[PDB]
Ligand binder design. Structure first.
Ligand SMILES: [Mg+2]
Lengths: 1332, 17, 252, 101, 153, 66, 126
């Protein structure tokens, strides 16, 4: 069966693959991150708890007075979302923390403790849709993709000296702290870099960890025992050592015959553990440990020292036999560490620590204390260094360890293992990591970044607490005096209010809202700059599969640094991206879902999304294309481990809305993916004729719609609110009743567009849960509708669509189906000045009566009165004084007696070019400023409306609850007639004989009086928030905001685009008579250009057209049978045939539902055409489109004949026509056209301003100056940079000449040049000008 | 034939092969 | 200067000069106060630091403005760079008598003309319109003509036709690669807010009708009106200077 | 090694489309960042050239340069007419028969 | 060394660090010249008092670009201290009329003291879109009279 | 870029690149600039010495320094 | 090189190539040096008059010039990419002004771009 919303209008689905995994909540990322941030976790794991347990406790300097952390709480917000928007203040929650102060008096061990909860800053709260309100605007904190912590092994091949030799380096990158580099040297030496500072040979750190030369040599090179026992030095032998090196003398093997794989195995049978060699070879070996003579005590040979015949005789004549040597192999086990020990000056621990210290802080002589403390802080202090869960996990996993959870600080074993791994990579056994591998990139969402910023705010105050806890007193103080909310909240405030990743939520489109919160930016703090990232990091990596959309991304300078999140992509427990897959067990595809991360998927081999998976759950083909190593190739049907979940798991939510995406080029697919989210809602909402089925998964998951919480029956329908009578089985036991929904009506959005919710259900209608109660902007019965259905025909037309221009019929602009309603907020601010406070009085000088006719006694535009540019909305007059008049003007003052005024004019006048209608006027009056007439009128209006809405909600709940009371009061005990005799308050007093129903009565009465108390308190709070004097900026009297509603039609110059990346601007609205038509006489809506199809690939726009025609033809049929009013039989049969088209499609439509009525309604909503769902990579093929065209009595080729309206003679060569989905982008021409003759100018340098913003002067850069220089145009260029921008005198001279009919310029000196002369002269430089 | 660069033609990769 | 609302807006130069003055004054005071060396040497170094940060900040230590991690811009920084004075002000400036809008096709145009919206024409040619209205006795004084053009009286439209006649206007595409990025056309008054462009010139501008925007400039002097007709005219430039081949050629 | 068997009309499958995006990205990205560097190049070019202007009618030198067709390998990349047209001869070209004009 | 020990406490008040340490050295000298070694007390205390005064008052003098009378800085600091202490009392922040109660001053002056505290914003402050445009750009010149009016003159 | 680094006019050079160094060197040199060119002429807002500017500068300069 | 646009930037900047080719300074049979000390030695042997010129070359660099053969000035003893300074000095102004144009025209010829040699020639002159 189908859910109610589907039975209202069914979308015919194509595509054979049945979807196993359901579309996840697209806003789960942000919501889950913030839920992690606020939820209380009783361990050090993620959250505010972690941030507190990190810095706390705060113990004084040896005073043993630590300020412990007990717990935290989040109180209710002081203002809700609506009031935070209207007032403009952040929507946050007060943060109360319970602190403890303990002191241990030395009669010993007494422990004093004090505890109180102190307020430390406020944390902003996230809305239900995954957004915050920082300053009255819904914002979004974009997730960040940064470099994961842990160890990373980089080649740095090539550029290193052009020698061909490839060095290596390892880089330990913590989550918080300094970096640790271990790099190589062209001479095969090892160097270690604490931060990007000096090189410092590697051993220097091993000595700082208390490792002697003997131990250092024993930790890298294998000991080889060489002794002169009895004579003819023997060698304790592992037969494998000789394997790699070249032979030198006779054993088995004679001199000069390098050891081969034959002799290695020849040495095993006889078990050769001993072989004697000549003396010269040993001379090329090193000694592992120090050897001193036993009697003299002097040293014979030190550690890491060469060996010679003379020194060998020294140690032999002393009685020494055992000789430790290093197993140095030039090919496999190099002398790396030994060759480095010779470049290391410090042979001990303290000297190495001193070297490190001087490398860190040069010029400051080091001591034991300073060096030890600096080192331990550097890498071994929880306070200064952390290698958190992700870092430690990747660190142990990369090092091939077992425990993936260790300490957050490094240890000696960690450093030694990282060095061993680097040296192994240098030896040939190992792998260098990929910087662009998605297994090495983490995702830090809003919650984690907020945690980090709050922790930063917590650490900056630690110094103060440490100060007051050492120099502070006894119980005289409590754990409050040393706290301050400003430093704690400063970091959080800065982060949320102004950050690279904190940006205004993208409204004007629900799809834009959903795709913005799913963004993953590589920029911002901790990331990299556009100018800092190379070309490689921006490319598509093979690991982007199923995680990020390879298409969706901006085509500007941020290519590859912004990409979106795939449909089924998800965040794994630590920081990485994982995609869903299905397990293949025996030969079958299970319905189990395994979420594999990048590295995880790396090992297995997964099947392909598009393949012969159907049917019966068994792979058909013997060879199926798959990917195992990130490489694609045909693998055996036997070896399949996993398979893709759906064909759309590789694209984003925006790319999945593109029908026939398989027929479009990647470039144009990206273009369309962005332009689609650039679409603004139309006046009427119109379902897409050809969709992908994802429209429901977007229009619902976006908070733009209204979805029922609990199922039931609609009690009351209204354009304002909706009252739903919940079912008896879905309601709570104690309280009401009904579900009340208050729809949003004509509210200004971020992009100044209009967001509004319209009810899509009528009175007394059944509604389950999950059914949309009211459609928001760009939504049709729960389906996302970003544009309109247009009848398109591909043919040139008098060059009116020459390059990409779009020829649109006049009917389209007639029907207002592309008209857009915008809302603008403009405010007049009356603030105090030197001459005195400004005034909002309607009394303005230098104005006519026709202008002031539209203002009230207080001077504010009347509500509902429509105005245009230039009209005064809020009359204001700023006090200006010391007026002086040219005697010519004093003559006028004396003649006509028109006296001058002592006040200037600042007024809220409608912006030039726009003409709307006033829908809202708000007045914020400061405290102490007397309320004018309009202010009191609006205040009384607000009070009345507030009490009205409150009492109406109260009455709805009251009636529902009293019906419940009757329910329980008329069973067990029966009262029917008498019960409706007495008033309803008497119902509350009555009681029943049997318990378990008297209990229900008590529950109902309790919750009833509870709701009454709640309503009373809420009404009192709202009245207080109204009457209370508003809080305004420091020195402003009043702020009168005016909201204008501008209805903008579609005119030449507005940008139009489809979903396939096809863009264009409208040349002109062509009359209906001149629009080409078909034989039936129905004109065409839009005339595109065929030449746009072959140049781009962009083939979808063709198919989406053809199929569209088919999907439209059906409608005609269903209209005819409804216009001919035959019966439900013909409708049912034909619609069955329509829903049963093609081959191997998953659709469940049998017209069993409400046989006569439900089918009638279904057809009533299908007369406009049958919507068709076209999956991303599983969309309908050509043959099914041909069939659907056949059913619609339409040609197979999808091409008909067209007649020109002007001539009437048909066009040769049949023209393709159909229906395409067109989007109106926000690049309207009304917001782009601007012109300027003479405006204001900049203060320091006299040049016309760039604002604000239409009246800014156009920019004439160096390139335009070169263009003027290429032609010989001296006067044009001079007047361009002298009269029109600079030359304070020349502007006025030229203007007067122009007004006098004389066109001649007297050029002067550009003011910027004199400013430059002054600036240069402001130095010890003297620059002047000569004679004349 | 002309560095595109998406697919090769004769001597170099190209925008259109 | 007071930044309204309320808060004041100063130059970092002021903070640098303030520091310099404070330090010179403290040095004078100490001199008269007879302080020992270490103090006065530290003060001398502070004064040198302040002076060097005032002249060319960043070479030594990058002194910072209060309430910010942003360094205060010094004198030398107000001259060098793409931003700053030389590149951004003297070699290029924002210019009066100019406009911007979205271009679209009108093929009916001749190669020497382009469709220009009337709304833009009124604003651009405002001084010409004022003078012409005052010349023919249609306006008593300049203010009367201002109010007339503000009132959208019919009589002014004809006047517009009179002042635009045979007055070339420079059309410019946002990116200017070569001199053909700017060409002069003969204005053709049109309704709507879209600018009509001739197709044959699109190849020269390298401009499509996919939403690209173009700017307009009105030549003021008689000499500029002649240079926009004999040198930069659309018809006086057909074949490119880089190669003899004509840049004006039928496209699609 | 695994080419795109399908043509745009038949429709791509997920794997081949993903393979195509690889080359698609380098194409899109190359245009954006090149925009920044081409400006630098042309700006340096205009900087090294500005003051050079046509100032004289004739210099009076026979030096010039020898213009010969760019005949690389088998055939010609650009004929001589195109590398000579619009310019002035340094000395009298004779007919292939020497000593003529 | 004691001068730096004292000056490190005040660092971030719109005044550079060496300015603080030097203004403290001045008070240290003034303490040296006015100290009786016979009182038996340790010179640390007297030097501390003098240096603390010489740093705080110097801050009041040389921090703000617009110099403010010395007592007004004290008043501002007192108001800020009271409004800081009352945070956990009022829950979020105190009502303005209360400070006039908690403070000795009547209420009508408190709003003037808060309107006075506004500091100048650098004209180099980046603007919306985090672009190269700065606050020193959007400032017009209003002293100029537009030519449309000079022609009428 | 290197050939452009060397120019008679110090204003023209200080405009294009390395303003600090060019200006310092031209300061110690006491060098002088008659502007003799395009960029320096647009800097002071004059007729560039080319095209129409060439026709005007020819007549003006013929009578100067002679 | 890369090449392309960066190549054009390299040619107009006269940037020394990675492994430059060196050029003979005067006519005459070439002569060898002492031995491999650091790089190697190479003795110029002019035929008639002044014959003291010399240079030093690395033995790691392979050689191409003939030993007992006459080799005029501006000849390739070693295969490799040439530098503008070397061409100008060992061939003349016209040779280098032709090399610059012929090399910078290949990158523009690869792409469908056609520009007369005159502008490149004016740049080379500057
Ligand atoms: Mg374009």
């Amino acid at each position: 069966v189908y859910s109610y919303t589907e039975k209202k209008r069914i979308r015919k689905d194509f595509g054979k693959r049945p979807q196993v995994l359901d579309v996840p909540y697209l806003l789960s990322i942000q919501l889950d991150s913030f839920q992690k941030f606020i939820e209380q976790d009783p361990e050090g794991q993620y959250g505010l708890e972690a941030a507190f347990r990190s810095v706390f406790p705060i113990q004084s300097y040896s005073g043993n007075s630590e300020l412990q952390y007990v717990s935290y709480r989040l109180g209710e917000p002081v203002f809700d979302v609506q009031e935070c928007q209207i007032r403009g203040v952040t929507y946050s929650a007060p943060l109360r923390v319970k602190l403890r102060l303990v002191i241990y008096e030395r009669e010993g061990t007494v422990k004093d403790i004090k505890e109180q909860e102190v307020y430390m800053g406020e944390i902003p709260l996230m809305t239900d849709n995954g957004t915050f309100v920082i300053n009255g605007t819904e914002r979004v904190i974009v997730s960040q993709l940064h470099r994961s912590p842990g160890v990373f092994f980089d080649s740095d091949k090539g550029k290193t000296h052009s020698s061909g030799k490839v060095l290596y380096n390892a880089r330990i990158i913590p989550y918080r702290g300094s970096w640790l580099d271990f790099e190589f040297d062209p001479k095969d030496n090892l160097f270690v870099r604490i931060d990007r500072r000096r090189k410092l040979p590697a051993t220097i750190i091993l000595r700082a960890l208390n490792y002697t030369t003997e131990q250092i040599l024993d930790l890298f090179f294998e000991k080889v025992i060489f002794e002169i026992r009895d004579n003819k030095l023997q060698m304790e032998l592992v037969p494998e050592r000789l394997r790699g090196e070249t032979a030198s003398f006779d054993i088995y093997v004679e001199k000069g015959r390098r050891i081969t794989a034959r002799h290695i195995r020849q040495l095993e049978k006889d078990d050769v553990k001993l072989i004697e060699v000549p003396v010269e070879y040993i001379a090329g070996k090193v000694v592992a440990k120090d050897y001193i003579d036993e009697s003299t005590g002097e040293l014979i040979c030190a550690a890491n020292m060469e060996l010679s015949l003379d020194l060998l005789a020294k140690l032999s004549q002393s009685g020494h036999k055992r000789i430790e040597t290093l197993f140095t192999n030039d090919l496999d086990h190099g002398p790396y560490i030994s060759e480095t020990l010779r470049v290391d000056p410090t042979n001990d621990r303290l000297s190495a620590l001193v070297e490190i210290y001087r490398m860190m802080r040069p010029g400051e002589p080091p001591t034991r204390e300073a060096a030890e403390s600096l080192f331990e802080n550097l890498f071994f202090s929880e306070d200064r260094y952390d290698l958190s869960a992700v870092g430690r996990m990747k660190f142990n996993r990369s090092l091939l360890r077992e425990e993936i959870e260790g300490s957050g600080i490094l240890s000696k074993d960690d450093i030694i293992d990282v060095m061993k791994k680097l040296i192994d990579i240098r030896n040939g056994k190992g792998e260098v990591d990929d910087i662009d591998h998605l297994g090495n990139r983490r995702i830090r969402s809003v919650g984690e970044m907020a945690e980090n910023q709050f922790r930063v705010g917590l650490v900056r105050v630690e110094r103060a607490v440490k100060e007051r806890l050492s120099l502070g007193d006894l119980d005289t103080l409590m754990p409050q005096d040393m706290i301050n909310a400003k430093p704690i909240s400063a970091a959080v405030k800065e982060f949320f209010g102004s950050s690279q990743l904190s940006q205004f939520m993208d409204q004007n489109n629900p799809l834009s809202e959903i795709t913005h919160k799913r963004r993953i930016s590589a920029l911002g703090p901790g990331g990299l700059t556009r100018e800092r990232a190379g070309f490689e990091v921006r490319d598509v990596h093979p690991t982007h599969y199923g995680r990020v959309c390879p298409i969706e991304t901006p085509e500007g300078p941020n290519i590859g640094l912004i990409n979106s999140l795939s449909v089924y992509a998800q965040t794994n427990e630590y920081g990485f991206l994982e995609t869903p897959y299905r397990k293949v067990t025996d030969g079958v595809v299970t319905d189990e879902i395994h979420y594999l991360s990048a590295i995880e998927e790396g090992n297995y081999v997964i099947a392909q999304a598009n393949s012969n998976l159907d049917e019966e759950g068994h792979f058909v083909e013997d060879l199926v294309t798959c990917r195992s190593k990130g490489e694609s190739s045909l693998f055996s049907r036997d070896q399949v481990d996993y398979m893709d979940v759906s064909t759309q798991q590789v694209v984003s939510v925006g790319a999945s809305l593109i029908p026939f995406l398989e027929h479009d080029d990647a470039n144009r697919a990206l273009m369309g993916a962005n332009m689609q989210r650039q679409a603004v809602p139309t006046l009427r909402a119109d379902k897409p004729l050809v969709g992908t089925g994802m429209e429901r998964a977007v229009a619902v998951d976006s908070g733009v719609t209204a979805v029922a919480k609990r199922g039931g029956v609609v009690q009351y329908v209204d354009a304002s609110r909706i009252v739903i009578k919940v079912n008896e089985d879905e309601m709570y036991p104690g309280e009401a009743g009904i579900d009340i929904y208050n729809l949003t009506k004509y509210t200004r959005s971020n992009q100044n567009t209009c967001i509004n919710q319209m009810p899509c259900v009528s009175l007394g209608e059944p509604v389950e849960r999950g059914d949309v109660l009211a459609d928001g902007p760009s939504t049709d019965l729960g389906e996302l509708a970003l544009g309109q259905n247009m009848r398109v025909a591909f043919m040139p037309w008098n060059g009116y669509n020459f390059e990409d221009s779009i020829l649109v019929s006049e009917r389209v602009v007639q029907e207002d189906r592309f008209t857009t309603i915008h809302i603008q907020e403009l405010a007049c601010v009356s603030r105090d000045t030197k001459l005195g406070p400004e005034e909002i009085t309607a009394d303005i000088p230098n104005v006519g009566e026709a202008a002031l006719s539209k203002l009230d006694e207080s001077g504010i535009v009347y509500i509902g009165a429509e105005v245009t540019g230039g009209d005064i909305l809020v009359g204001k007059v700023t006090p200006k004084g010391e007026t002086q008049l040219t005697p010519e003007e004093k003559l006028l003052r004396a003649i006509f007696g028109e006296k001058a005024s002592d006040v200037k004019d600042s007024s809220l006048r409608v912006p030039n070019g726009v003409s709307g209608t006033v829908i809202d006027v708000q007045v914020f009056t400061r405290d102490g400023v007397e309320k004018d007439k309009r202010a009191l009128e609006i205040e009384e209006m607000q009070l009345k409306q507030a009490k009205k809405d409150l009492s109406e909600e109260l009455q709805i709940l009251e009636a529902g609850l009293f019906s419940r009371i009757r329910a329980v009061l008329v069973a067990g005990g029966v009262e029917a007639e008498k019960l409706d005799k007495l008033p309803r308050d008497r119902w509350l007093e009555l009681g029943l004989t049997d318990e378990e129903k008297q209990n229900q009565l008590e529950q109902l009465a309790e919750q009833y009086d509870e709701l009454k108390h709640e309503f009373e308190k809420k009404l009192e709070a709202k009245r207080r928030k109204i009457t209370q004097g508003d809080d305004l900026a420091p020195g402003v009297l009043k702020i009168v905001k005016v909201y204008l509603a501008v209805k903008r039609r579609i005119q030449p110059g507005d940008k139009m685009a489809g979903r396939h990346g096809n863009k264009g601007v409208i040349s002109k609205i062509n009359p209906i008579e001149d629009m080409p038509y078909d034989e039936n006489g129905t004109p065409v809506d839009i005339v595109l250009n065929p030449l746009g199809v072959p140049s781009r690939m962009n083939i979808g726009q063709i198919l989406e057209t053809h199929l569209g025609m088919a999907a439209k033809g059906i409608g005609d049929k269903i209209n005819a049978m409804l216009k001919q009013q035959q019966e439900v039989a013909k409708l049912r049969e034909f619609i069955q045939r329509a829903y049963d088209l093609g081959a191997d499609v998953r659709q469940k439509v049998d017209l069993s539902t409400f046989s006569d009525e439900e089918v009638m309604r279904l057809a009533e909503n299908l007369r406009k055409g049958m919507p068709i769902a076209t999956p991303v990579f599983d969309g309908a093929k050509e043959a099914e489109i041909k069939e659907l065209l056949k059913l619609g009595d339409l040609p197979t080729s999808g091409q008909i004949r067209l007649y020109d309206g002007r001539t009437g003679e048909q066009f040769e060569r049949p023209v393709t026509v159909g229906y395409m989905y067109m989007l109106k982008l926000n690049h309207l021409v009304d917001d782009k056209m601007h012109a300027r003759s003479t405006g204001s100018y900049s203060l320091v340098t006299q040049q016309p301003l760039g604002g604000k913003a239409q009246f800014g002067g156009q920019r004439f850069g160096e390139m335009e100056v070169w263009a003027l220089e290429a032609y010989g145009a001296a006067y044009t260029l001079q007047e361009m940079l002298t009269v029109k921008s600079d030359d304070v005198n020349g502007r006025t001279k030229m203007y007067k000449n122009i007004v006098d009919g004389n066109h001649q310029m007297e050029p002067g000196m550009p003011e910027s040049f004199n400013v430059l002369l002054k600036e240069i002269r402001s130095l010890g430089i003297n620059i002047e000008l000569e004679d004349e | 034939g002309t560095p595109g660069f998406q697919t090769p033609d004769a001597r170099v990769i190209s925008r259109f092969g | 200067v007071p930044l309204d609302g309320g808060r004041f807006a100063t130059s970092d130069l002021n903070d640098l000069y303030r520091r310099v003055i404070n330090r010179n004054n403290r040095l004078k005071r100490l001199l008269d106060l007879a302080a020992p060396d270490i103090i006065v040497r530290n003060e001398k170094r502070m004064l040198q630091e302040a002076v060097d940060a005032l002249l060319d900040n960043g070479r030594r230590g990058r002194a910072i403005t209060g309430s910010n991690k942003r360094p205060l811009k010094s004198l030398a920084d107000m001259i060098k760079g793409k931003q700053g004075r030389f590149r951004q002000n003297l070699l290029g400036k924002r210019v009066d008598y100019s406009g911007r809008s979205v271009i679209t096709v009108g093929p009916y145009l001749r190669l020497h003309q382009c469709g220009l919206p009337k709304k833009m024409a009124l604003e651009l040619f405002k001084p010409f319109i004022y003078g012409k209205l005052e010349l023919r006795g249609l306006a008593t004084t300049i203010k009367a003509a201002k109010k007339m053009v503000e009132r959208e009286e019919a009589v002014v439209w004809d006047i517009l036709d009179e002042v635009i006649r045979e007055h070339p206007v420079l059309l410019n595409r946002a990116p200017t690669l070569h001199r053909l990025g700017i060409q002069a056309f003969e204005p053709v008054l049109i309704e709507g807010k879209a600018i009509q462009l001739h197709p044959l010139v699109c190849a020269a501008y390298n401009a499509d009708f996919d939403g690209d925007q173009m700017a307009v400039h009105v030549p003021l002097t008689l000499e500029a009106q002649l240079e926009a007709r004999a040198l930069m005219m659309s018809t006086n430039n057909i074949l490119s200077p880089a190669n003899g081949e004509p840049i004006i050629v039928p496209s699609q | 090694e695994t080419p795109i068997t399908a043509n745009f009309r038949e429709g791509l499958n997920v794997l081949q489309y993903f393979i195509s995006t690889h080359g698609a990205r380098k194409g899109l990205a190359d245009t954006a960042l090149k925009t920044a560097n081409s400006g630098y190049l042309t700006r340096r070019l205009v900087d090294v050239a500005q003051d050079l202007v046509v100032t004289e009618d004739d210099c009076g030198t026979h030096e010039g340069i020898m213009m010969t067709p760019v005949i690389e390998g088998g055939d010609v990349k650009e004929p001589l007419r195109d590398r000579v047209l619009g310019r002035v001869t340094a000395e009298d070209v004779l007919k292939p028969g020497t000593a003529d004009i | 060394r004691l001068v730096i020990s004292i000056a490190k406490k005040y660092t971030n008040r719109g005044l550079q660090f060496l300015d603080l340490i030097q203004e403290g050295n001045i008070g240290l000298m003034k303490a040296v010249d006015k100290f009786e070694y016979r009182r038996g007390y340790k010179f640390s205390t007297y030097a501390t008092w003098w240096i603390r005064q010489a740093i705080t008052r110097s801050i009041a003098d040389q921090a703000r670009t617009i110099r403010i009378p010395v007592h007004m800085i004290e008043t501002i600091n007192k108001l800020n201290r009271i409004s800081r202490q009352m945070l956990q009392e009022m829950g979020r922040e105190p009502t303005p009329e209360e400070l006039a109660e908690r403070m000795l001053m009547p209420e009508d002056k408190i709003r003037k003291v808060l309107k006075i505290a506004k500091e100048p914003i650098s004209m180099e402050t980046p603007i919306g879109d985090d672009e190269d445009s700065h606050l020193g750009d959007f400032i017009e010149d209003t002293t100029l009279e537009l030519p449309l009016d000079s022609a009428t003159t | 870029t290197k050939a452009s680094l060397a120019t008679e006019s110090f204003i023209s050079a200080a405009s294009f690149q390395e303003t600090t160094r060019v200006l310092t060197e031209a300061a110690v040199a006491g060098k002088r600039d008659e502007l003799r060119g395009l960029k320096e002429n647009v800097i002071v807002g004059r007729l560039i010495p080319a095209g129409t500017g060439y026709a005007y500068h020819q007549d003006r300069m013929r009578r100067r320094a002679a | 090189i890369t090449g392309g646009l960066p190549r054009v930037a390299d040619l107009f900047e006269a940037r020394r190539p990675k492994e430059p080719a060196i050029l003979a300074e005067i006519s005459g049979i070439v002569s060898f040096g002492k031995e491999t000390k650091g790089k190697r030695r190479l003795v110029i042997t002019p035929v008639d008059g002044s014959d003291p010129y010399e240079e030093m070359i690395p033995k790691w660099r392979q050689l191409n010039v003939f030993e007992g053969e006459r080799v005029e000035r501006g000849d390739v003893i070693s295969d490799g990419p040439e530098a503008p300074h070397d061409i100008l000095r060992l061939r003349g102004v016209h040779a280098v002004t032709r090399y610059i144009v012929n090399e910078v025209q290949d990158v523009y010829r690869l792409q469908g771009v056609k520009i007369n040699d005159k502008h490149i020639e004016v740049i080379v002159r500057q």
